[PDB]
Design an enzyme around this catalytic site. Structure first.
Site, PDB file in Angstrom:
ATOM      1  CG  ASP A  21      -2.061  -1.114   1.029  1.00 12.40           C
ATOM      2  OD1 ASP A  21      -2.767  -1.135  -0.003  1.00 12.40           O
ATOM      3  OD2 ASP A  21      -2.205  -1.943   1.955  1.00 12.40           O
ATOM      4  CE  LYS A  24       4.177  -3.107  -5.398  1.00 12.30           C
ATOM      5  NZ  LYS A  24       3.935  -2.749  -3.970  1.00 12.30           N
ATOM      6  CB  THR A  25      -1.058  -0.767  -8.343  1.00 15.61           C
ATOM      7  OG1 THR A  25      -0.486  -2.008  -7.909  1.00 15.61           O
ATOM      8  CG2 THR A  25      -2.008  -1.047  -9.506  1.00 15.61           C
ATOM      9  CG  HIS A  84       0.791  -8.227  -0.060  1.00 19.36           C
ATOM     10  ND1 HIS A  84      -0.339  -8.677   0.584  1.00 19.36           N
ATOM     11  CD2 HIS A  84       0.554  -6.932  -0.379  1.00 19.36           C
ATOM     12  CE1 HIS A  84      -1.226  -7.701   0.641  1.00 19.36           C
ATOM     13  NE2 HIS A  84      -0.710  -6.632   0.063  1.00 19.36           N
TER      14      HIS A  84
END
Ligand SMILES: Nc1nc2c(ncn2[C@@H]2O[C@H](COP(=O)(O)OP(=O)(O)NP(=O)(O)O)[C@@H](O)[C@H]2O)c(=O)[nH]1
Ligand SMILES: N[C@@H](Cc1ccccc1)C(=O)O
Ligand SMILES: CSCC[C@H](NC=O)C(=O)O
Ligand SMILES: [Mg+2]
Ligand SMILES: [Mg+2]
Ligand SMILES: [Mg+2]
Ligand SMILES: [Mg+2]
Ligand SMILES: [Mg+2]
Ligand SMILES: [Mg+2]
Ligand SMILES: [Mg+2]
Ligand SMILES: [Mg+2]
Ligand SMILES: [Mg+2]
Ligand SMILES: [Mg+2]
Ligand SMILES: [Mg+2]
Ligand SMILES: [Mg+2]
Ligand SMILES: [Mg+2]
Ligand SMILES: [Mg+2]
Ligand SMILES: [Mg+2]
Ligand SMILES: [Mg+2]
Ligand SMILES: [Mg+2]
Ligand SMILES: [Mg+2]
Ligand SMILES: [Mg+2]
Ligand SMILES: [Mg+2]
Ligand SMILES: [Mg+2]
Ligand SMILES: [Mg+2]
Ligand SMILES: [Mg+2]
Ligand SMILES: [Mg+2]
Ligand SMILES: [Mg+2]
Ligand SMILES: [Mg+2]
Ligand SMILES: [Mg+2]
Ligand SMILES: [Mg+2]
EC number: 3.6.5.3
Length: 393
Positions: A21, A24-25, A84
């Site tokens: 979180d 990144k995306t 993750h």
RNA sequence: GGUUUAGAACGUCGUGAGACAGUUCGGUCCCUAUCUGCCGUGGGCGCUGGAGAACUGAGGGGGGCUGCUCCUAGUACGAGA
């Protein structure tokens, strides 16, 4: 599958790296809308970067999604990695094909435990270059606080063995550039300039014969089974003999169409992510980890000698000895695999931070040759890097 | 409906009449409210000339329940979830 992809501008494999979180995306989505608006490529959105039920009800990303944004100099191909600690396996496949990364540290939280683990995997696999991006900025309106985080990232890279101070750090909010703020739009246009300037033209191998590791398999409704991945070496012509080597056994095949982001191709050159359509093969019998090689070039092996460099507490790995019987994960080109260790005669124990050779019997056979690089991992962390010495089987 | 009358049956105990929180089917639930109380609603006189209005408020009563969603914020917290 209609428009022919015209071979102009050099191809480069890029991808975002960083903590969970951390933007990144969202950075990937910011890069599309900025570059598509000004220059005039294909639009796309934050939507489909990650859909499914798994990446909506949660919000997190599991699959390594891909994006195609174009610029005047070069034609980039993104690889948005998950993030993750649990999704490190399918990340390494995205990270191995990636030439030059985009690290994502945040100005609020700073360098967090995964940021150390992600860059650790980048070195041992194969990530030549890296670029930093502060992905919050606006949340903390301060000059001294934001610049203190930049110091810790320069220290992190230089401590873990990168250029560090030479790497161009960029500041900019991802959400502010999604909408249409003139100051923040231009600040991520600057990141596209840093991508061209810092990362050089990549050195391909368009001479030695064809190889292609499979990152992810598909089953297109109408056409057949398809395999994606970066072409490690050589070329692929349509209607050419291709032998699939790796897990299970070995199968004959022929290519019936190569593509690049839902667009046709004649020749699939080296150092670029392409979707190869295979003739007369089912979705189940072909799997992830296998390699598309030209017949006769490579042979699958289940036993091999290998010069392994084990890591210490300081470098980041094991901190205790181990005898024959030990079974860690061996990450070759894409997939991992377990194997028993048989040490040489005259070596009672293997201490951490030591260079030795050893025989390793794998449970699954994988395609390999003399002089192949891999990174051993076990227990949610790295163990040691190394190289293959001899073939046995 | 159950228990707890009179009919009848089963098991059981009793030579038998019969008996058994053992079981089984059937089996009349009355009262126009004097007083207290209570809910309403008036007549009487009082309140110090009589009468019509409008208030004040001692005092009394009524009312007081809570879910979810969404923002704050995927912010603090957390290796992550
Ligand atoms: N205010 C603000 N918020 C941001 C910015 N960039 C990212 N965020 C927030 O950070 C969160 C993380 O989003 P995302 O990038 O999808 O997560 P990720 O970095 O890909 N990691 P993973 O997908 O493994 O969970 C989102 O809620 C998003 O709103 C920014 O520039 N400003
Ligand atoms: N070379 C592929 C990369 C890709 C793989 C898997 C899914 C999406 C994209 C294009 O398309
Ligand atoms: C013939 S059985 C009589 C039941 C008894 N009478 C109560 O009024 C009870 O107790
Ligand atoms: Mg957080
Ligand atoms: Mg993500
Ligand atoms: Mg936090
Ligand atoms: Mg009865
Ligand atoms: Mg009775
Ligand atoms: Mg009787
Ligand atoms: Mg009785
Ligand atoms: Mg009984
Ligand atoms: Mg009857
Ligand atoms: Mg009746
Ligand atoms: Mg009756
Ligand atoms: Mg009457
Ligand atoms: Mg009363
Ligand atoms: Mg009244
Ligand atoms: Mg009166
Ligand atoms: Mg009177
Ligand atoms: Mg009077
Ligand atoms: Mg009066
Ligand atoms: Mg008076
Ligand atoms: Mg008066
Ligand atoms: Mg009066
Ligand atoms: Mg009044
Ligand atoms: Mg009043
Ligand atoms: Mg009350
Ligand atoms: Mg929220
Ligand atoms: Mg979350
Ligand atoms: Mg926020
Ligand atoms: Mg902490």
């Amino acid at each position: 599958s209609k428009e022919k992809f015209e071979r102009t501008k050099p191809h480069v494999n890029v991808g975002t790296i960083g903590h969970v979180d951390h933007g990144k995306t969202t950075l990937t989505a910011a890069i599309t809308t900025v570059l598509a608006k000004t220059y005039g490529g294909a639009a796309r959105a934050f939507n489909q970067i990650d859909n499914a039920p798994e990446e909506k009800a949660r919000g997190i990303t599991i699959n390594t999604s891909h994006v195609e944004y174009d610029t005047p100099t070069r034609h980039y191909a993104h690889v948005d990695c998950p993030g993750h600690a649990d999704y490190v396996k399918n990340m390494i496949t995205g990270a191995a094909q990636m030439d030059g990364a985009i690290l994502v540290v945040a100005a609020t939280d700073g360098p967090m435990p995964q940021t150390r683990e992600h860059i650790l995997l980048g070195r041992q696999v194969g990530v030549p270059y890296i670029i930093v991006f502060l992905n919050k900025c606006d949340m903390v309106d301060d000059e001294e606080l934001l610049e203190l985080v930049e110091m810790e990232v320069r220290e992190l890279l230089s401590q873990y063995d990168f250029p560090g101070d030479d790497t161009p750090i960029v500041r900019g909010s991802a959400l502010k550039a999604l909408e249409g703020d003139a100051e923040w739009e231009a600040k991520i246009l600057e990141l596209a300039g840093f991508l061209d300037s810092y990362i050089p033209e990549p050195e391909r191998a368009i001479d030695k014969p064809f190889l292609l590791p499979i990152e992810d398999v598909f089953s297109i409704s109408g056409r057949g089974t398809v395999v994606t991945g970066r072409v490690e070496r050589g070329i692929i012509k349509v209607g050419e003999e291709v032998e699939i080597v790796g897990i299970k056994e070995t199968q004959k095949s022929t290519c019936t169409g190569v593509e690049m982001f839902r667009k046709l191709l004649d020749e699939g050159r080296a150092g670029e992510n392409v979707g190869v359509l295979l003739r007369g093969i089912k979705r189940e019998e072909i799997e992830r980890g296998q390699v598309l090689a030209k017949p006769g070039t490579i042979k699958p092996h289940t036993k091999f000698e290998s010069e392994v460099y084990i890591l210490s507490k300081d470098e980041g790995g094991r901190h205790t000895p181990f005898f024959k019987g030990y079974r860690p994960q061996f990450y070759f080109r894409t997939t991992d695999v377990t194997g028993t260790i048989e040490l040489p005669e005259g070596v009672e124990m293997v201490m951490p931070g030591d260079n030795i050779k050893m025989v390793v019997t794998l449970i699954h056979p994988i395609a390999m040759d003399d002089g192949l690089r891999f990174a051993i991992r076990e227990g949610g962390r790295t163990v040691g890097a190394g190289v293959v010495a001899k073939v046995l089987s």
